[PDB]
Amino acid sequence: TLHNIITDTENVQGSFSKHEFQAETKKLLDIVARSLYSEKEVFIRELISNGSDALEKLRHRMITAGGDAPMEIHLQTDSVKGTFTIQDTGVGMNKEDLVSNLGTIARSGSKAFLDALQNQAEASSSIIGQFGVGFYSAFMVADKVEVYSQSAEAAPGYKWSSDGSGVFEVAEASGVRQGTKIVLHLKDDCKEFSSEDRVKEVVTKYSNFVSFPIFLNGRRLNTLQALWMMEPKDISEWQHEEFYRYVAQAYDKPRYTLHYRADAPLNIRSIFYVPEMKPSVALYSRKILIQTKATDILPKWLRFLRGVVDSEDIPLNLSRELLQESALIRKLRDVLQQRVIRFLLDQSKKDPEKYARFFEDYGLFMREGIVTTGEQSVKEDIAKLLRFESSALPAGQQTSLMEYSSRMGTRNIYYLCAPNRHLAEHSPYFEAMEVLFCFEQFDELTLLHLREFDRKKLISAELSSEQAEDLLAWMRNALVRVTNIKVTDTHPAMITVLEMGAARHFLRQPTLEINTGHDLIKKLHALKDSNPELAQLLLEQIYDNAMIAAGLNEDPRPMISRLNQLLTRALEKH
Amino acid sequence: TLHNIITDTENVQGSFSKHEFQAETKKLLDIVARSLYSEKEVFIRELISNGSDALEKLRHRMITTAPMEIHLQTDSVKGTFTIQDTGVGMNKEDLVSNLGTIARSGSKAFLDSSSIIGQFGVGFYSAFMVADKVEVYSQSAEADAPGYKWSSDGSGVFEVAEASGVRQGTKIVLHLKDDCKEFSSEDRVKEVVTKYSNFVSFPIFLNGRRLNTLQALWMMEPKDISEWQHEEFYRYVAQAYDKPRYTLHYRADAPLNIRSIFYVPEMKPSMFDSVALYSRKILIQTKTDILPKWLRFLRGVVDSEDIPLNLSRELLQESALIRKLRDVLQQRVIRFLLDQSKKDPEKYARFFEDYGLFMREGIVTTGEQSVKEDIAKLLRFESSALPAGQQTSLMEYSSRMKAGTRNIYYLCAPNRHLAEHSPYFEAMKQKDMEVLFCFEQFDELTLLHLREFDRKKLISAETDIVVDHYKEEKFQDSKPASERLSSEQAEDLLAWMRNALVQRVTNIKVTPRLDTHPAMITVLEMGAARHFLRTQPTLEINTGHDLIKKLHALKDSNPELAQLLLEQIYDNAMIAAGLNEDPRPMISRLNQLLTRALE
Numbered sequence A: 001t002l003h004n005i006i007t008d009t010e011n012v013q014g015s016f017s018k019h020e021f022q023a024e025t026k027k028l029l030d031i032v033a034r035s036l037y038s039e040k041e042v043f044i045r046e047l048i049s050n051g052s053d054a055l056e057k058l059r060h061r062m063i064t065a066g067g068d069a070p071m072e073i074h075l076q077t078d079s080v081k082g083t084f085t086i087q088d089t090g091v092g093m094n095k096e097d098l099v100s101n102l103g104t105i106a107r108s109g110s111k112a113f114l115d116a117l118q119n120q121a122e123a124s125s126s127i128i129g130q131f132g133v134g135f136y137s138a139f140m141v142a143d144k145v146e147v148y149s150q151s152a153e154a155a156p157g158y159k160w161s162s163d164g165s166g167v168f169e170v171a172e173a174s175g176v177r178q179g180t181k182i183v184l185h186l187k188d189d190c191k192e193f194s195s196e197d198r199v200k201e202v203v204t205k206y207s208n209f210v211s212f213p214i215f216l217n218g219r220r221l222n223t224l225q226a227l228w229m230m231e232p233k234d235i236s237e238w239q240h241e242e243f244y245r246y247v248a249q250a251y252d253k254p255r256y257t258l259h260y261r262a263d264a265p266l267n268i269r270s271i272f273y274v275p276e277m278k279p280s281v282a283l284y285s286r287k288i289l290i291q292t293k294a295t296d297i298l299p300k301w302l303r304f305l306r307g308v309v310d311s312e313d314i315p316l317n318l319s320r321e322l323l324q325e326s327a328l329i330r331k332l333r334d335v336l337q338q339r340v341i342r343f344l345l346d347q348s349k350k351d352p353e354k355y356a357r358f359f360e361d362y363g364l365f366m367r368e369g370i371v372t373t374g375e376q377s378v379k380e381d382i383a384k385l386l387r388f389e390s391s392a393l394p395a396g397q398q399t400s401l402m403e404y405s406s407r408m409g410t411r412n413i414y415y416l417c418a419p420n421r422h423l424a425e426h427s428p429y430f431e432a433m434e435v436l437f438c439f440e441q442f443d444e445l446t447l448l449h450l451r452e453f454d455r456k457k458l459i460s461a462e463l464s465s466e467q468a469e470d471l472l473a474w475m476r477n478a479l480v481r482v483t484n485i486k487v488t489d490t491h492p493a494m495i496t497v498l499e500m501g502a503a504r505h506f507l508r509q510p511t512l513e514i515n516t517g518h519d520l521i522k523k524l525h526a527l528k529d530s531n532p533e534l535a536q537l538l539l540e541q542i543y544d545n546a547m548i549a550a551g552l553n554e555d556p557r558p559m560i561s562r563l564n565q566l567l568t569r570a571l572e573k574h
Numbered sequence B: 001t002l003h004n005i006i007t008d009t010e011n012v013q014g015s016f017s018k019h020e021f022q023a024e025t026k027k028l029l030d031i032v033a034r035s036l037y038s039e040k041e042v043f044i045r046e047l048i049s050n051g052s053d054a055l056e057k058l059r060h061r062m063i064t065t066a067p068m069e070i071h072l073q074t075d076s077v078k079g080t081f082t083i084q085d086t087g088v089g090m091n092k093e094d095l096v097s098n099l100g101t102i103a104r105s106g107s108k109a110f111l112d113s114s115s116i117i118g119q120f121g122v123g124f125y126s127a128f129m130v131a132d133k134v135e136v137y138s139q140s141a142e143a144d145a146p147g148y149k150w151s152s153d154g155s156g157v158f159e160v161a162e163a164s165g166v167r168q169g170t171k172i173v174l175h176l177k178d179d180c181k182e183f184s185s186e187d188r189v190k191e192v193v194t195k196y197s198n199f200v201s202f203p204i205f206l207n208g209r210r211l212n213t214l215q216a217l218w219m220m221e222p223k224d225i226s227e228w229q230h231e232e233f234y235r236y237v238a239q240a241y242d243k244p245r246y247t248l249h250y251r252a253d254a255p256l257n258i259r260s261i262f263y264v265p266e267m268k269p270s271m272f273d274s275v276a277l278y279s280r281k282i283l284i285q286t287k288t289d290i291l292p293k294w295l296r297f298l299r300g301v302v303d304s305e306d307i308p309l310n311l312s313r314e315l316l317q318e319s320a321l322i323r324k325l326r327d328v329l330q331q332r333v334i335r336f337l338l339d340q341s342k343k344d345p346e347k348y349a350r351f352f353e354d355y356g357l358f359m360r361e362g363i364v365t366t367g368e369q370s371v372k373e374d375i376a377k378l379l380r381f382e383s384s385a386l387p388a389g390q391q392t393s394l395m396e397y398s399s400r401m402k403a404g405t406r407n408i409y410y411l412c413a414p415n416r417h418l419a420e421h422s423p424y425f426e427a428m429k430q431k432d433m434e435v436l437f438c439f440e441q442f443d444e445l446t447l448l449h450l451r452e453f454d455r456k457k458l459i460s461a462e463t464d465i466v467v468d469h470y471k472e473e474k475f476q477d478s479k480p481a482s483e484r485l486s487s488e489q490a491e492d493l494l495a496w497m498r499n500a501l502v503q504r505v506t507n508i509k510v511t512p513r514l515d516t517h518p519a520m521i522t523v524l525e526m527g528a529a530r531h532f533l534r535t536q537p538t539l540e541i542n543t544g545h546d547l548i549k550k551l552h553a554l555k556d557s558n559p560e561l562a563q564l565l566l567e568q569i570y571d572n573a574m575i576a577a578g579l580n581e582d583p584r585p586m587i588s589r590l591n592q593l594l595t596r597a598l599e
């Protein structure tokens, strides 16, 4: 019944030949040009990153061999010639740099630069180059590429030129300004990148926080500081509100701001915002956008946060729009979860009222978090954020699991999840002679998934007599909608329900209790004989009023006409 | 003031040198090994794809008998993963040139048919993501050619020697690295095969047991697919346990190549944020959605040849293509659902029961008026001009409109009885336009966002009642002036009510448009007000209604009782208008009123 053909049957004879791995350069160029990036526009990102790196090298170079010039990135679109041009005033390239760096796929001069640096250096974390392929993204959109380059050394200017097809040319040129100018002659299906507004869209999308001024057709673009890199000390609330509206594409204010920077266990520069209004985070690296919707760095229940996470250390996929499977990323996610939880807890103690209102707006996310995480200490960490009412506190007052333990030789935390307080207080099960009252949606699924908190089990609780019994018997046969009617102040009756789950389901089998001492019931009894219509109308009205007061009839519209008929025929004797 | 440094200033001197592009092979190997694929498991996919290609080359070449299979073997004690195919194999120049050169693909040389998966020439090196050492035994079919053993580190060199006992085809053995030993466990490997290669055209055996690989039904002739085949395939792709209530098998060649199957489940939803995207029987990843968000209730599969694959085979390459495909699929699904509603209106009624919230969401969230109206073609309602229970559409409503009419009138109420006896419908009956009856909670928000349909403005009965004030409102009473309050009585009553409800209504008027109801609350933009409260009203009285005449008599006779009754009438109109706040505080007052009316 098993069919396997794999056996140790092979034996090498003769001798082995040795061979070095090779690489077909033309196919690699084609792969970068058509198969690497999900969108053509990304060539702009790559070229701008290169310009940034160039300027960064010059800044590094001016620390000792000091001297000169402005540090800028300039873009120019020519819609008539169909050209895109980028020029940086950076370190430039001599002929060996052009031949070696531009001419060799996967050779990165910026990688070699970074590897030679003292790790403490600024340039160590600002250089956005590793792979040695970004430049070839230009052939994604261009039939021809020309590069004019003038190195900062004292060296002629050069023109490098190619059509992307396995060969390029190098000649000497005048007069190249120090730095590098790249002219892309766009393909017919890419002329959109000779349009100014299109280019500006792309620049703001990926490179809006590049550390150097970016000019387009003589006008400056990137006026935004990357606030997540700066000392939390130096950010106004105004900086944060403007930055939040930009990064969240919003128009309100952040109600909470967490500016989290850490160097251990990994490099983290981030800002998280909780919006003011009632209901993602972008991933960056070295100030360049990776994902506008970071996918695996936060847990799914923290998707209500807005803002930015940047890490120098995150291993990037070759396309720079994905991350690589890594234990580092799961560690980062766990770290950020702990950090956000600690932040939220401390908010809840620094301002309990603001936190109450935060939890009323966003608690569904923490209920979901508790329900979905597998680790019990994480469930309890999140569960510290929950609020409830309690049998031992007035209505409206919020309390926590910690305070419930605080008011306990007692071993267990008893709870009752119900649509509202009236049904909870009249629960048969609320026969406890403290009970958490959990009125919020999905509360009971949350508490069941949580199981225990701080080692204590969360446990669910789950005038007369003439015709008291003919009055009541008449009512039993006239509303056969309730299963019992029994006799028990200001109200003539109330609706009571045995198990809260049934009421929950109904809102998506009740007991009626009557007060034989108040006037409308004595007169329901008195008009069971005298006037049967009026007694039926009054009966249905008392039932409906008890349903409303119990909170299980929130749209009384079906009753209104009947009520009017009751009223009209009750006032007919006036 | 502009600041631009870019000027046409540069010119060549002298002569040019010519150069060929080069490649740093060592770093390229490192990149394939650590930076190309976002997930290690895909090496299995790549190797299986290679085997499939080999078998295809054999299948093609022997159609001018041998077994054609892929075998996978896991050895958890030696930490080894082994794959062997019975395909064409490789001679020594194939091993040296094709395996030895990154981005060199022999499958390019093969072509010239649509079954070959490989195009990039790098998939093989995916093995070095998970393996310290790789060995390849290969025997080419073809012919008078010895067997070979190829072996390597991943580190810049590999070895080739002649070998005996090599079965025709290719066997690759991966010595897994220590933190990749998961791919030495059978259940993990089967997970990966099922995930990526469940539709491979050849049998795959794992440790001597054949894996249940599937036919790719979306590529096949729709008429040749039974309902049971669709039920089984639906259960697989949706990972479900019910059956599809609807099946749409959609193939197209223009404007794009499309092979797809969509299912609507029989069960009711629970899923508010779904279709798999494929190419050549190998899975791509939906991360980005190819359907609009309102169609996320669909299950199934989309395959399109026009979608370009990224080097890692987990992203797609032009998002304008994706928006075009999304619009095509949206159009096609709408057409399908409309045709379902006309071939079986009752089954469609239960579908619209169960899933209408998705179409409402689509209408509310889309920016384009033609798309809102396209989706709105799916909405169903009842009508004042149809028997209770019978459903109609916006298109049928406009088919019954008399030529001199400009607007589509609707009324939102909990059910048909409440709509039919609505005070607002009583006022609309005095006109003679059909009124749509909408029963679902978010119908009115939907219609407000839809605004117009087929060039006709959508107007609520409440709004129209308010507007008629500001026109010739030539409507007079159900009851002759004999059984009404006169003008003296009416305006004395009204003055009293203005003084008894001073900060609760903006004006109080008599209206001629009511019959059964004593009063109603009117607000110009009533739907928007209802919506707002779910986070200046006018009270209109029916001086022909008994409760109003007796309020008139009781302001004099019994002032306290008259105030209690007045506040009750106001509350009743607020409730009937869907503008009432929690009705619980009223109950005590109501009880008191009742007790004082029953003496």
Ligand SMILES: Nc1ncnc2c1ncn2[C@@H]1O[C@H](COP(=O)(O)OP(=O)(O)NP(=O)(O)O)[C@@H](O)[C@H]1O
Binding pocket: A046, A049, A050, A051, A053, A054, A088, A090, A091, A092, A093, A101, A102, A107, A108, A109, A110, A111, A128, A129, A130, A131, A132, A133, A134, A135, A136, A179, A180
């Ligand atoms: N504008 C520029 N000015 C100076 N040197 C440049 C410029 N653009 C590219 N270079 C050089 O050319 C090399 C190749 O660039 P590129 O192909 O983009 O790879 P990379 O920037 O090194 N790493 P990556 O961008 O992540 O692939 C760089 O490392 C630089 O040495």
Ligand SMILES: Nc1ncnc2c1ncn2[C@@H]1O[C@H](COP(=O)(O)OP(=O)(O)NP(=O)(O)O)[C@@H](O)[C@H]1O
Binding pocket: B046, B049, B050, B051, B053, B054, B085, B087, B088, B089, B090, B098, B099, B104, B105, B106, B107, B108, B117, B118, B119, B120, B121, B122, B123, B124, B125, B169, B170
């Ligand atoms: N099992 C095999 N049998 C025969 N030839 C094979 C086999 N595996 C690989 N080859 C050869 O080696 C080449 C390189 O394989 P590979 O690196 O996987 O790239 P590819 O399949 O051609 N394209 P891709 O899968 O998209 O990366 C193939 O084109 C074949 O010529």
Ligand SMILES: [Co+2]
Binding pocket: A008, A010, A011
């Ligand atoms: Co042996």
Ligand SMILES: [Co+2]
Binding pocket: A115, A116, A117, A118, A119
């Ligand atoms: Co160092």
Ligand SMILES: [Co+2]
Binding pocket: B008, B010, B011
């Ligand atoms: Co010139």
Ligand SMILES: [Co+2]
Binding pocket: B399, B400, B401, B402, B403
């Ligand atoms: Co007509």
Ligand SMILES: [Mg+2]
Binding pocket: A046, A049, A050, A128, A129, A133, A134, A135
């Ligand atoms: Mg670069």
Ligand SMILES: [Mg+2]
Binding pocket: B046, B049, B050, B118, B119, B121, B122, B123, B124
């Ligand atoms: Mg391959």
